[PDB]
Design a protein around this ligand. Structure first.
Ligand SMILES: CC(C)CCC[C@@H](C)[C@H]1CC[C@H]2[C@@H]3CC=C4C[C@@H](O)CC[C@]4(C)[C@H]3CC[C@]12C
Ligand SMILES: CC(C)CCC[C@@H](C)[C@H]1CC[C@H]2[C@@H]3CC=C4C[C@@H](O)CC[C@]4(C)[C@H]3CC[C@]12C
Ligand SMILES: CC(C)CCC[C@@H](C)[C@H]1CC[C@H]2[C@@H]3CC=C4C[C@@H](O)CC[C@]4(C)[C@H]3CC[C@]12C
Ligand SMILES: CC(C)c1nc2cc(O)ccc2c(=O)n1-c1ccc(C#N)cc1
Ligand SMILES: CC(C)c1nc2cc(O)ccc2c(=O)n1-c1ccc(C#N)cc1
Ligand SMILES: CC(C)c1nc2cc(O)ccc2c(=O)n1-c1ccc(C#N)cc1
Lengths: 531, 222, 101, 531
């Protein structure tokens, strides 16, 4: 099973001998026979090499351009350019998975991808290779975006083939030109709108394990497509949602502020301010109900893996968690428990903290919020672990020294914490023996945490800012891109016609002769060189 | 003390623990004094296990560099100012902070953001008292403390790339220490690699070497 | 310079003294050249010795970095690993780790 | 007077024509005639060009190597290679002043300096050109160090001349050699010991206007000469002075600490602690007298310009000021005034701050102190100016708002200053009208000074650290070098024989044939290339 299905034709291509493969083809050796061996499969837990499980793909994946043309343009036995393995990966799919985003492999794969598309048009004019999907139902374009192959995704998106009768395989066209000025179109098909896997959908709705999902939106069609989606309709809908949440969170703030302080809720209706407060309290629960149902609407439609629900898209959880706090308030309010206030102030504090969601849509706010994110997961977490070891380590030493009031682990942890915030007493208690021991414990704690730990946290954040400053504009654009796609799905949901980016334009001719119309996106470039 | 101070600090805590037992059975109340230093050092010794975690270990390596490169330089100059101005202040104070300890503590509180600036009025020449405190504040708080943050940032910048190599060395010493202590009977179940035929002795005998496998992928040099 | 001069004097020793193993010889301090390079911090020659691959037949047994097999872009390379983690007196890992800073 | 003294021979060399100058020399035109024109002088307040006021130096300063050889190796009229202008600058002096430390000029001057030394040996074997001093009494070597010409100072110090019969003009010799190893000597004459102007003395005792005085000690002979002067004898004398000052400043601390608090000094003698305290008080005045006389000893021997006494050598000023405080203390003590306590606590604080002088002699302490000085002179002054503007403005506004107790400009300046140190009340007074005005004034002050000014001072120091980190090891070495030379002058002062660096060694032969002995400094270098 380790090499099951392997034929002598596989070894000839493996050894890189064009004469040896010719003899086997001449003798009738099977060319479509597939090596369904685990060594030839991915099998990430074991060493091996994946190439597409086909002799034809072996030549393509091993830079054997002649053997690819040999297996297709010969006379004895012509290989199938549309052949799919057990996984269903076409040779185009195999070329995508071989790519590993390094400099040399990208030039390799994007080249071999070109001619095998060029050859297929000459040999199978009516067949469209890229439209074929594997058993996973992913086209090579969708697989490159899914697996993070930015090197070949950039190639496919802005592909232009100069040679006639195969120009219709191109994706980046040209409407016209001038002296220094030329306007170039983009195919834009299966990019923003598609049946199953759009390029924008797969790049945005990734699991954060994708290598270059931030930079995959930087390729030329995607950045301008998302930016114009923002400017056309998404920006105003986002600003409307921002205003509604601000209005909702101010109504909730005033209803909580003017809550009655008498016992045993619910509270009876009196005067005129109670009807205004209950009015604002009804709208608060409605917003809590809306954010509760929008959360499960998010869980059912995207099915998070419980790993990409806390690291990414935690904003969805924190909005859902606030709704949970709001619904718990209503349960406790009608249960006559005073603990409804405890849940209501956590819903109030989290609800106002959730106002930081809308820092995307503003470039300087969004980049700032992306940097705030990086500190918590890179600097604050490391600081707090070491700080809590010191804080709990010295508090237990101090409270053991304290005798017969700070003789409590909580009262001592609070006094030592005040040192962090510039409010350290250093003489908060005198109820002990061994005053020298007490002073040495506090002075050691002060030097280790205040002078050393806190000042070094500032030094570490500056190092974090330096590295992430250039890249944080790409995380923000990804965060806004997810907002752009989420807005489209929620808003239109009836016709999907007013937000159509680009326009249907005649780009060329089908090789049969029919007119091909592609929803194309226009980009104008100016070059003062290459006249 | 420079390297393997973790062994010293773990041994020193044990010395504090054994001194506690000596004083506990000697009927001295000072066993508590030794026991809280054993408690505080024992919890500080919990930072030994920050190795074995990459981001914790690199963080702990950077913490170590500050103490031996930035904190030590700062404390020498700071203590000169602290003791230099405390003696000037406590000498001005008359007939209660008229103690070198009580004045060193008041001037230290300025460092931690708790400086009174009016803690005592028992002196003559109020202008002298204010000029001494304002000079101390500007020299240590505005200048010395803010410059320590500036120096740590320069230390972080230089050691950021290299600190992944000190951590791996620290974990490597832990890896070898674990091997020696754990097995210590057979040394068979933890051996790396495997005996594999690599070639032939020039005489003609088969040579078997415990070899470690590495797989590399190169898309150039076909 | 050194990693070259070290090479041929090993190649020549194989041709001239096939039965003799030069690297196994220890000085009065009881340290082999491999252990001495790790002890004294000679990373330039320690890197050479550890992944030494000699192409010459009849001299290939002096290599320390072998090759199990190969593929188109893929090749698996072995390493001698002898006197590295386990050794009688001075392992490379032991001497590098148990240094004096 | 603008071009007075200029001859036609000057114009021919100016125009760079070797044929034209030949005709004038053939016709008897004066070659030693000097153009004593202000346009040909330095005259930094007016445009011009200085070249040495001689036709021969014009060729040297204008890269006219042939004309230099023409004016010296011809038959009709030979120019004087030892000719000096009105300022007395020899052509070697002129070449030094032309150099401006740029990359191309250094190759220019250090070359032209070489061959004009070549010709002098061949044409005037008994004459020594470099030993000639101008009207200022400075040799070309001393002038290059004085004016900051590091490019040519490096050339002169480590000069090796390959030509036989010209090798005795070299300054960097070679004792022997090995395979990769070779030991090279250095002339070391007029470097550490000289009659008037040593290279070490002039570089160290500069006015801080010299361009590269920090880097002028980095040239190969000077760094190792000063480092070995440190290790031989200066280091232990410095550590002895550090210990004596520590002992003196602790005796002074204890005498001040245990001062009697009764009225009307001097105080009578009782018990046994008063004799111990007066003993410590006698030694305190003696140290004050010693630092007073050492200060004037510094003023008389070096004569500071009152500009290089505050920016550089402020350590001398601060020690002298502490001595002045001590003498004022004695005067007030014997005048029965209580203000001796004020003068003496100022003396105590300044004397303990003076303990930072001895941070030189320790590399890390010295670099740290140099960085502290850079902060004080670069960031702290700017911050204090802007901060004092803000503090005074808002304090005047607040104390004007305050009515009928913080109704004092001092009491309000102190309350607003406490905000800087993390002790700001924000509610220190309620004796006013217009509570909103009071809050807006304080909140504006807090945001402008605490959140903005203080946090940006930390940001500026980090930028200062980044730039000065590499160079601060060179300011420290200069500061230690001044300490090394100061120690030599003070310590030996009788024989100047035990600290002699290097040794008298036979380097070669005088061109006459006599043995030349130079106090030479040995440096051993290892090169594994150039076999
Ligand atoms: C009572 C409420 C308001 C407390 C304050 C809000 C808290 C819960 C919010 C505000 C900022 C949030 C964090 C922002 C960034 C990150 C990094 C991300 O990769 C994981 C989640 C994490 C770590 C978030 C966790 C929840 C968080 C800490
Ligand atoms: C009472 C106890 C807990 C005091 C706090 C723990 C002290 C003793 C520990 C915590 C961190 C430790 C330091 C960590 C880093 C270094 C750098 C190293 O090259 C020398 C030792 C030195 C300087 C350690 C000395 C001891 C140390 C300061
Ligand atoms: C008597 C009390 C106030 C003593 C306090 C110490 C004061 C006076 C000392 C300590 C540090 C010193 C400074 C250190 C560095 C510099 C930079 C230099 O280019 C000019 C002098 C200057 C600005 C010094 C001025 C005096 C100074 C501020
Ligand atoms: C950490 C930032 C400030 C943040 N904090 C939140 C807190 C919440 O309670 C809920 C949601 C958020 C939230 O979305 N962000 C966030 C993240 C990325 C971008 C970008 N680009 C914009 C905003
Ligand atoms: C300074 C750090 C935080 C530290 N502090 C300790 C304190 C003690 O009291 C005892 C031991 C330690 C200790 O080992 N480290 C340390 C050092 C290097 C690495 C790495 N890589 C991991 C941890
Ligand atoms: C600013 C530093 C801390 C300082 N402060 C002083 C304060 C005084 O009151 C008197 C003298 C000094 C003093 O010399 N330095 C200083 C300067 C340079 C070098 C170097 N290299 C070493 C020390």
């Amino acid at each position: 099973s380790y090499y099951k299905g392997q034929t002598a034709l596989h070894i000839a291509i493996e050894r890189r001998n064009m004469a040896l493969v010719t003899l086997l083809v001449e003798n009738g050796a099977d060319v479509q026979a597939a090596a369904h061996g685990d060594f030839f499969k991915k099998t990430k837990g074991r060493p091996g090499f994946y190439f597409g499980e086909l002799p034809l793909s072996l030549a393509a994946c091993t830079n054997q351009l002649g053997i690819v043309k040999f297996l297709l343009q010969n006379s004895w036995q012509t290989a199938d350019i549309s052949a799919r393995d057990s996984v269903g990966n076409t040779v185009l799919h195999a070329l995508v998975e071989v790519a590993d985003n390094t400099a040399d492999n990208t030039k390799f794969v994007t080249s071999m991808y070109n001619e095998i598309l060029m050859l297929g048009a000459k040999l199978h004019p009516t067949l469209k290779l890229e439209e074929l999907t594997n058993k996973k139902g992913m086209t090579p374009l969708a697989l490159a975006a899914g697996t993070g192959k930015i090197g070949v995704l950039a190639y496919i998106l802005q592909r232009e083939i100069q040679e006639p009768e195969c120009r219709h395989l191109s994706r980046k066209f040209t409407e016209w030109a001038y002296g220094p000025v030329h306007s170039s179109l983009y195919d834009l098909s299966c990019i923003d709108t598609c049946e199953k896997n759009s390029v924008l959908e797969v790049i945005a709705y990734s699991s954060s394990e994708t290598p270059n999902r931030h930079d995959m939106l930087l390729v030329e069609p995607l950045n301008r497509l998302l930016q114009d989606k923002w400017d056309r309709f998404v920006k105003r809908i986002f600003y409307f949602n921002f205003l509604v949440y601000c209005l909702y969170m101010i109504i909730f703030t005033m209803a909580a502020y003017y809550r009655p302080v008498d016992g045993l809720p619910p509270f009876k209706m009196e005067k005129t301010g109670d009807y205004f407060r209950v009015t604002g309290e009804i709208l608060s629960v409605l917003g809590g109900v809306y954010f509760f149902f929008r959360g499960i609407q998010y869980f059912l439609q995207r099915r998070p893996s419980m790993k990409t629900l806390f690291v990414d898209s935690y904003s969805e959880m924190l909005f859902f968690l606030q709704s949970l706090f709001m619904l718990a308030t209503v349960v406790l309010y009608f249960s006559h428990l005073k603990e409804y206030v405890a849940s209501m102030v956590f819903s109030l504090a989290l609800g106002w903290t959730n106002m930081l969601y809308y820092t995307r849509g503003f470039q300087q706010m969004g980049i700032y919020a992306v940097m705030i994110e990086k500190m918590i997961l890179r600097d604050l977490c490391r600081f707090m672990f070491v700080y809590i070891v010191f804080l709990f380590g010295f508090s237990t030493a101090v409270v053991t020294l304290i005798e017969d009031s700070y003789n409590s682990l909580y009262s001592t942890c609070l006094e030592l914490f005040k040192f962090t915030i510039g409010m350290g007493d250093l003489e908060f208690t005198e109820n002990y023996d061994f005053k020298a021991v007490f002073i040495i414990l506090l002075l050691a704690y002060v030097i280790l945490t205040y002078i050393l730990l806190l000042n070094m946290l500032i030094a570490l954040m500056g190092e974090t800012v330096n590295k992430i400053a250039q890249e944080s504009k790409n995380i923000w654009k990804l965060q806004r891109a997810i907002t752009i796609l989420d807005t489209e799905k929620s808003f239109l949901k009836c016709m999907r016609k007013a937000f159509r980016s680009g326009k249907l334009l005649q780009v060329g001719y089908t090789p049969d002769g029919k007119d091909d119309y592609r929803w194309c996106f226009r980009v104008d470039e100016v070059n003062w060189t290459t006249w």
